[PDB]
Amino acid sequence: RIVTTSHGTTTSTTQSSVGVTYGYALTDKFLPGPNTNGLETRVEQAERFFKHKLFDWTLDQQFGTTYVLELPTDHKGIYGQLVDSHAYIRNGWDVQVSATATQFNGGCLLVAMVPELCKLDDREKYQLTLFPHQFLNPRTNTTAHIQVPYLGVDRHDQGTRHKAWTLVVMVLAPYTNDQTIGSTKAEVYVNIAPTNVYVAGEKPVKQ
Amino acid sequence: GILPVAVSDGYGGFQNTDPKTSDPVYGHVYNPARTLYPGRFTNLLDVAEACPTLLDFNGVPYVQTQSNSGSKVLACFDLAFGHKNMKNTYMSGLAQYFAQYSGTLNLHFMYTGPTNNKAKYMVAYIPPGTHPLPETPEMASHCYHAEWDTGLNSTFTFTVPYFSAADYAYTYADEPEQASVQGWVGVYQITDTHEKDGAVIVTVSAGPDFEFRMPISPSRQ
Amino acid sequence: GILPVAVSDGYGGFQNTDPKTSDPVYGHVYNPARTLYPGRFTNLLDVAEACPTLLDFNGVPYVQTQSNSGSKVLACFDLAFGHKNMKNTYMSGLAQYFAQYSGTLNLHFMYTGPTNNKAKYMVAYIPPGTHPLPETPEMASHCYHAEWDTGLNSTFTFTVPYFSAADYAYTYADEPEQASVQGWVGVYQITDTHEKDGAVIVTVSAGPDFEFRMPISPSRQ
Amino acid sequence: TTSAGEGADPVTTDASAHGGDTRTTRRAHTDVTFLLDRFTLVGKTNDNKLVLDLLSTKEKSLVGALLRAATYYFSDLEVACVGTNAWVGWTPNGSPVLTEVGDNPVVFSRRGTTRFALPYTAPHRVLATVYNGDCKYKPIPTTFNYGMIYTQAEVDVYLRMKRAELYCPRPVLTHYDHNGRDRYKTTLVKPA
Amino acid sequence: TTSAGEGADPVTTDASAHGGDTRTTRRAHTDVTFLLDRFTLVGKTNDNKLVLDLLSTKEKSLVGALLRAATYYFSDLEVACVGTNAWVGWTPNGSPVLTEVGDNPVVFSRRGTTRFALPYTAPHRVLATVYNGDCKYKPIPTTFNYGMIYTQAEVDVYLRMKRAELYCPRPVLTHYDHNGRDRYKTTLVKPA
Amino acid sequence: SGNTGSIINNYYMQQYQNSMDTQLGNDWFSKLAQSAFSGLVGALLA
Amino acid sequence: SGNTGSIINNYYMQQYQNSMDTQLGNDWFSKLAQSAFSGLVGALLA
Numbered sequence A: 001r002i003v004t005t006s007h008g009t010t011t012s013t014t015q016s017s018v019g020v021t022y023g024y025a026l027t028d029k030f031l032p033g034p035n036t037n038g039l040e041t042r043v044e045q046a047e048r049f050f051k052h053k054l055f056d057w058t059l060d061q062q063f064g065t066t067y068v069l070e071l072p073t074d075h076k077g078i079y080g081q082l083v084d085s086h087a088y089i090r091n092g093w094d095v096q097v098s099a100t101a102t103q104f105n106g107g108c109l110l111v112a113m114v115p116e117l118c119k120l121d122d123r124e125k126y127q128l129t130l131f132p133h134q135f136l137n138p139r140t141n142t143t144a145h146i147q148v149p150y151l152g153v154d155r156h157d158q159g160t161r162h163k164a165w166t167l168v169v170m171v172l173a174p175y176t177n178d179q180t181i182g183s184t185k186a187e188v189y190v191n192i193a194p195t196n197v198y199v200a201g202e203k204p205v206k207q
Numbered sequence B, C: 001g002i003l004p005v006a007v008s009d010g011y012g013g014f015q016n017t018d019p020k021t022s023d024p025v026y027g028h029v030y031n032p033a034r035t036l037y038p039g040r041f042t043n044l045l046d047v048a049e050a051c052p053t054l055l056d057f058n059g060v061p062y063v064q065t066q067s068n069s070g071s072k073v074l075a076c077f078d079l080a081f082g083h084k085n086m087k088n089t090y091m092s093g094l095a096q097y098f099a100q101y102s103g104t105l106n107l108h109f110m111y112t113g114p115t116n117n118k119a120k121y122m123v124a125y126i127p128p129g130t131h132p133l134p135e136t137p138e139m140a141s142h143c144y145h146a147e148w149d150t151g152l153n154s155t156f157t158f159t160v161p162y163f164s165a166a167d168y169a170y171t172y173a174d175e176p177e178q179a180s181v182q183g184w185v186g187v188y189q190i191t192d193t194h195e196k197d198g199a200v201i202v203t204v205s206a207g208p209d210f211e212f213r214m215p216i217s218p219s220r221q
Numbered sequence D, E: 001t002t003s004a005g006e007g008a009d010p011v012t013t014d015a016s017a018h019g020g021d022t023r024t025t026r027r028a029h030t031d032v033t034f035l036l037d038r039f040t041l042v043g044k045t046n047d048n049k050l051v052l053d054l055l056s057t058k059e060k061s062l063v064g065a066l067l068r069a070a071t072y073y074f075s076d077l078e079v080a081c082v083g084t085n086a087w088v089g090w091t092p093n094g095s096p097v098l099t100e101v102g103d104n105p106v107v108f109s110r111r112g113t114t115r116f117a118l119p120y121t122a123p124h125r126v127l128a129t130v131y132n133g134d135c136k137y138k139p140i141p142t143t144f145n146y147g148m149i150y151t152q153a154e155v156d157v158y159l160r161m162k163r164a165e166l167y168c169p170r171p172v173l174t175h176y177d178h179n180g181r182d183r184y185k186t187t188l189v190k191p192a
Numbered sequence F, G: 001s002g003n004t005g006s007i008i009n010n011y012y013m014q015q016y017q018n019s020m021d022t023q024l025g026n027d028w029f030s031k032l033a034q035s036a037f038s039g040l041v042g043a044l045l046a
Helices: A078-085 A124-130 B044-050 B090-095 C044-050 C090-095 D032-036 D062-067 E032-036 E062-067 F028-034 G028-034
Strands: A003-007 A010-014 A050-058 A066-071 A086-099 A106-115 A133-136 A143-148 A165-176 A185-202 B005-007 B073-078 B098-102 B105-111 B119-126 B144-149 B155-160 B184-192 B200-206 B211-215 C003-005 C073-078 C098-102 C105-111 C119-126 C144-149 C155-160 C184-192 C200-206 C211-215 D039-044 D049-051 D070-082 D089-091 D113-118 D148-150 D156-169 E039-044 E049-051 E070-082 E089-091 E113-118 E148-150 E156-169
Touching: A003 A086, A010 A086, A050 A066, A050 A165, A066 A185, A078 A086, A078 A185, A086 A106, A086 A133, A086 A165, A106 A124, A106 A143, A124 A165, A124 B090, A133 A143, A165 A185, B044 B090, B044 B200, B044 B211, B044 G028, B090 B098, B090 B200, B105 B119, B119 B155, B144 B155, C044 C090, C044 C200, C044 C211, C044 F028, C090 C098, C090 C200, C105 C119, C119 C155, C144 C155, D032 D062, D032 D156, D039 D062, D062 D070, D062 D156, E032 E062, E032 E156, E039 E062, E062 E070, E062 E156
Parallel strands: B005 C003
Antiparallel strands: A003 A010, A050 A185, A066 A165, A086 A143, A086 A185, A106 A133, A106 A165, B073 B184, B098 B211, B105 B155, B105 B200, B119 B144, B119 B184, C073 C184, C098 C211, C105 C155, C105 C200, C119 C144, C119 C184, D039 D156, D049 D148, D070 D113, D070 D156, D089 D148, E039 E156, E049 E148, E070 E113, E070 E156, E089 E148
8 A cells, every 4th residue: 555646846655545535526627717817827836745743643632622724824835935926826735644653552533624614513523524534543544645626616716814625633533552552642744735726916025 | 359268266376385487587697607616416315325424322423342331232223313323414414304215224333443452243233023122142143134353444334224014214203102113223242352442433324225205394493 | 168377476566677578559650761870889898898988087187297206106096997086987987887897908098298208107907915005117017017118109008907716896895895806007107208297198998808797777875 | 009099090908918818708788778678767747647758767877877878869668657546648759738648549557557568759760868959068859759648646657668779879977976085885785 | 345444435335235125216305406496484674675695594494404515506596575565676796785776676566475586696606605714713705695685565585596506515413302312203293 | 689588479469569660772889899909019029 | 407397388588587607618426426335345155
C-alpha cells in the first residue's frame, strides 16, 4: 500500500494507503464563466503541498471531540501571495491527513471534508458520513486522503472570508494504549495542496 | 351560440399537492449556467444506500466488550426506525416522512482494537414471536445469523432481511404494540482475547432493494 | 350532456403583466401607411451601444488639469450606475428600471486642447477590496489599465470589464454597503505640457456584451 | 482605441485588447415591444369620462418613462378599468364628445374590472410624444388620442400598448435623488 | 462480507449470502423532485409584505426538512396566498424595497386565494441553505432570495418548488421525542 | 411578439383583435450599432 | 417530471411558465451507489 502523491516540487510517500476518496466529482474540471470576462489565469506554481499540525490524539478525548480547519487557511508561501495580488480566486483541494499511532494502540478518528460548515450540532455528528470522508484506525492505517473540487454558489470567491470547505477530524472511538508498547498520544498532521488555482482581478501588492 | 359548459361542485378548490401549474406572470428570464455542478442527488435512497450513519448506544456509536457481566450480548434491539439506537441515523431521519417501507437493510461493524487484540462476533435476526430472546451465541445460532472474526479486514457487513405477513411494514409503532412486530437484531460477542474493551463501530444503510412509500408531513408536537 | 369543467381558485384574477389578450370590440380599421418611417428602434441596448452620453463632474462633462494640487487623479469613482458622476447618463437612466445587469462598458475620452498643448493619460479598473486606492500612475499601473497620449486622434475608448463572483451584479446599492462591491475606475493624468487646463470630455456607452435583466417600475418617493 | 471622435461614427470595444472574452448576451429584457406590453395605471376617470391619451401615463413609471424615450410611436391598445362600476363605453378618435355613449361600443363589467381591446384610431401614420408646433423655444394636437371612455362610476384606468413601434430615441434621466451623497443606495430586498 | 472499511468505498449487500432473493423496488416516493413539488405553508405576511426565502419553510415539515438535507439547490417557484385579501404583487431578486408595488407584476385574488408562477431570479448559478461566509466555527447573503411579495391584507403564504435540483446531501435528524422509552410509538390511524 | 405567449392561439379574428396595417408602393439603430468600429487604429505590438 | 401530471398539456409558452436554463461550453450519488461492492471478499464454501 505504498503510494506517492506529487504536486510540483513536493512529494508525499505513504506506506499505509487505504486509497483516495473523491468527493462529489472525479475531477475538478474548470469551466470559465462570464464573471471573469475571460481574464482569469491559472497559476500552477501555487499547486504544491503545505503542512500543519492539527492536534494530539490523546487518551482523554471522547467521542464527538472535533477539530476543524477552514480552507483556505493562512499561507506563508506562493498561494498566500495570490491573495495579495488578486481580488478573485478559485481552486480545489488535495487533502492528506495522518495520525501516527502504533498498531498496538486503538481507537478511531473520522476525517471528512464538509462544505459550508457554519455550525454543527452534536446529533449531526452521527451523520458526518454523508460527507466525503475516510477513517484513521491504528490497526490498519495512519493515512487518509480525500480529493475535492471547487464548490460554491459563485464561480469564484472574493479572497477568503468565505470558507467553502472545512476539514473536520472527529473522534469516533477513543484512543487507547492498553498493550504496553503503544504510544500515549498520536500527533495529527495535515498535508494539503490547492489544485486548479485560477485568479483574476489584479491589484497592487504593498505600498 | 357558444360552448355550453357545466361547472362542477366539489372541483376547483385550492389544493396543496395538485398536479397542475399556476399561471405565469414574468417571462424571458435566462438562468446562469449550472453545468457540471458537483454532488447532485436525485433520490434519497441513493444517498441512503451509499452513506452509512451511526447508531447510538447510550451516547456512543460503538458497542463494547464492557465491564462486569458474563453477558455476551453487545446489543439487541427492535427492528424499528423508532428504536432509540436508530435515533440519529439518516434512515430513521428519512423514515419519519414515510408511512410504510419494505426491503432489506445493511448493518456494518468496524473493529477498532489494537493488532494483538482478537475477538469473534456474531449477529442474528430474531423473528417476531420468538420467545425468550436468546442471550447466548449457542441459542442465537438457531436464527438467521452470521459469525465473523477479526483479522486484516476491520469491517463486516450484514443483511437484515424482510419477513412479514405483508409486503410492506410501517415505519411507526402503534401505541398498543407490546412486542416488535418486526422482530429484533441481536449482536453478540462469542469471545475476546483481553477484557480491556475493543470498540466495534456500528453503522446502518439501506439495502439494494429497500423502499419507502407514502410521503407524510408528520409535523409538530 | 355537456362538458364538465372545474373552476379553479387562485386563477383568473386581473393581472397587469399577463400573457393574454383582451376581447376585441371594434373591427375593420386599416391604418395609414407607415412604410419607411425613419429612426426606428427595437432594443434599448442598440441605442445604448451607439450613443455615448455625458458624465458629470460637479456640473461639467469634462475632467481637467485643474488648479492647486499635486494630485494626478482626474477622477476616481465607483463602478456603479448610482454614482453621482453617472447621474445624467442614458445608461443610468435605463438602469433604474432593471434589477440586474452583466457585461462590459465603454468609457470614451475626447481631448479638447489646442494643437501645441500635449498630455499623457491613463485609466485603470480597480477591483473591489483593493486597499489604499492608488493615487499615483505608478501604483495604479498594477491594475488592468490603459495609457495613451494626445496626437492626431482626439478620442480614446476604454473597456471597463466585468469581474465578480456572480454572473450578474445589481444596478442598485443596498443601504448597508460601505465600499463599491464592483470596484472603481480611476482616471489619471500622467503629465501635461502647460498647466492651463486642457479639457477631456468623458462619455459612457454599453459594451458589445452588456445586458440588463428583470424590468422593474421602481416608482416614486 | 484612438479615433477621430469629432465625426461621431460609433465605436464599441471588447476586452480583447486586454486579453478578454465576450459573454453571451440575451437582450430579451431591453426589447421595446416586450417592455411596453403591460398594463400601467394612469389614474381615475373624471366625470366618468377619460380621454385615452398615452401622455397620461405616469412619467416615472417604467412605461411612462420608456414611451417618452421616443419622439414617435404607434401601437394598438388594451384597456382595463378597475373599480366597482357597471360598464365602460367608448368612442374613437375624432368623434364629438357625448352626453351618453348609448349605442357606441359598450362593455359590461365582470368581477369588478372591465378589460377590452382597441385599435389605433388616429388619422396620422404615427403619433408623437412632443410636437414643436407653434411654441418657439428660446434657450400636442387634438388629434393625438386613442378615443374616449365613458363609465358608470369612478374607476382606476389602465392602459396596455400592443404591437408597439418606437422611433427617434430621446433622453431617459435618473429620478432618484442623491441628496449630497456620492453613491445613491437604498434598501434592496434581503432575507429578514 | 469483510472489507477494509477505512477507505470508505461503499458496500451494499443482498440476502443471497443466506439464500435470499431481492424484491422489485420502485423508489418513486424518494424522488427529490417529486417530493419537493408541493405547496408548503411558510406563514403569514408582515406589513402585507413577505420576502420569498425558502429558508422560511418550517424545518420539521416534509419540504422544510428535505430542502435542508442539501447544501445547494435550484428551482423555479409557485406561490399561493390564502386569505381574504384582494391582490398580491411581486418584485424580483435585487429590486429596492418599495412603498407600493404599483406597476410591477400584480395578480388579483379569485375565491379567496391567489396562486401564481415565478422564475428563479437570483444572480448565482445555485443557492445554498448554509453559507460559511465570515462566521468562524469553533468546536446567508442578501442575494439568496426569490423576490418579495406585497399584499392588500394579511394572508397565509404557501411556496411550491418546481423543477428542483439538490446537491451535496446533509443530515436529516428524527424529531420525535423518545422521552425515556426505548421504542418510540404513537397512535397510528386505525378503524374505530 | 411582445409580452404575450399562449402556446395555443387567439379565438377572435385578426380584423377584430387588431388594426390592419397598410403599405405604400428597417431598424436604423440596429444597423447603426452593427456599424460601430470595434477594431484598432494604428499598429499593434506583442 | 416532478409531481405534475396532465395527460393533456400546458397552455402558456415555456418562456413564460419557467426560467430558461443555459449552458457553458450527472447524478453523482446514483453513480456512487452503483459502484458499491456487493460481492464476497475471500473464498466461499458450500
